[PDB]
């Protein structure tokens, strides 16, 4: 996990071993950030977008930094065209897609594209919908933008991107309005975990099936959470960070796809929300 928020934006980069279970620090981020997204390309970990909500500022971030697990260094790469708080990111073929996010009162529909070989950014076609807190998942090398917030309404809609024609296509909407949900692909297709629908945080978790173009519910977690991190590696996806409306939650819940149960596995030293998570 990289970044996060508790009283202020955080520089924490700090891992967890579900095999061991203990918590230990690594190099801090260069600039504290929350509302960012994390992803891997070629083993390296890249923290993307966000903002630094601090006692002396609230600066939306257009930067992104690459970290290497071989040498514990964060190295700045080229920044985007605009800052993106509450961004969503998707990895196809080890390439970086930056989706939506906000800059001040502007809620982006713009999307950008980054190549770790070359280190650049270029604009692609805008989304149908402006989306901050948008969940982004990649499936069969298609880029999906799920839920979010357009500045007035929170969204249950989702849309798909085609890397060959620069066109966005609305698909079937989720059963639940979700902003700040945890969105990832597990096994077959797209999972949508938790989020905020404008009145409550969500523990219900939805799942999309592309062949049937159908969203179907799965067992809900024990504790609600929005602005959570999400990552896949060994199946059995965990949820880390978030917020339920009063306390910056301190639960790591684990959903098993076979028996479809949730149970709290562990906890890091402090509550936290708005993280960018990926695993190498």
């Amino acid at each position: 996990t990289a970044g996060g928020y508790f009283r202020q934006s955080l520089s924490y980069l700090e891992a967890y071993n579900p095999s061991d279970g203990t918590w230990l620090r690594l190099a801090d981020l260069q600039v504290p950030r929350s509302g960012l997204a994390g992803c891997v390309v070629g083993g390296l970990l890249y923290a993307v977008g966000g903002r630094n909500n601090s006692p002396d500022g609230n600066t939306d971030s257009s930067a992104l930094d690459c970290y290497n697990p071989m040498t514990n260094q964060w190295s700045p790469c080229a920044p985007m065209s605009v800052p993106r708080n509450r961004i969503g990111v998707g990895v196809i073929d080890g390439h970086i897609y930056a989706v939506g996010g906000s800059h001040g009162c502007i809620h982006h529909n713009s999307v950008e594209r980054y190549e770790p070989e070359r280190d650049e950014w270029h604009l692609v076609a805008p989304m149908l919908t402006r989306r901050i807190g948008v969940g982004v998942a990649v499936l069969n090398r298609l880029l999906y933008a799920v839920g979010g917030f357009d500045g007035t309404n929170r969204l249950n809609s989702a849309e798909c991107y085609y890397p060959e024609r620069n066109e966005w296509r609305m698909i079937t909407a989720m059963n639940t309005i979700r902003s700040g949900a945890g969105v990832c692909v597990l096994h077959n297709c797209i999972y949508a975990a938790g989020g905020y629908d404008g009145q409550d945080q969500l523990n219900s978790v939805e799942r999309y099936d592309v062949a049937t173009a159908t969203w179907t519910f799965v067992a809900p977690m024990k504790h609600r959470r929005s602005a959570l991190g999400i990552t896949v590696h060994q199946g059995r996806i965990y949820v880390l960070g978030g917020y339920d409306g009063h306390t910056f939650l301190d639960s790591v819940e684990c959903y098993d796809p076979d028996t479809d149960t949730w149970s709290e596995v562990t906890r890091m030293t402090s509550g936290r929300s708005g993280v960018g998570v990926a695993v190498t």
Binding site: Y5, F149, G195, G198, S226, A227, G245, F248, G274
Partner: peptide, 9 residues
């Protein structure tokens, strides 16, 4: 503070 992520105004 803010309902979705808990960050301050």
């Amino acid at each position: 503070l803010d309902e979705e992520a808990g960050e301050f105004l």
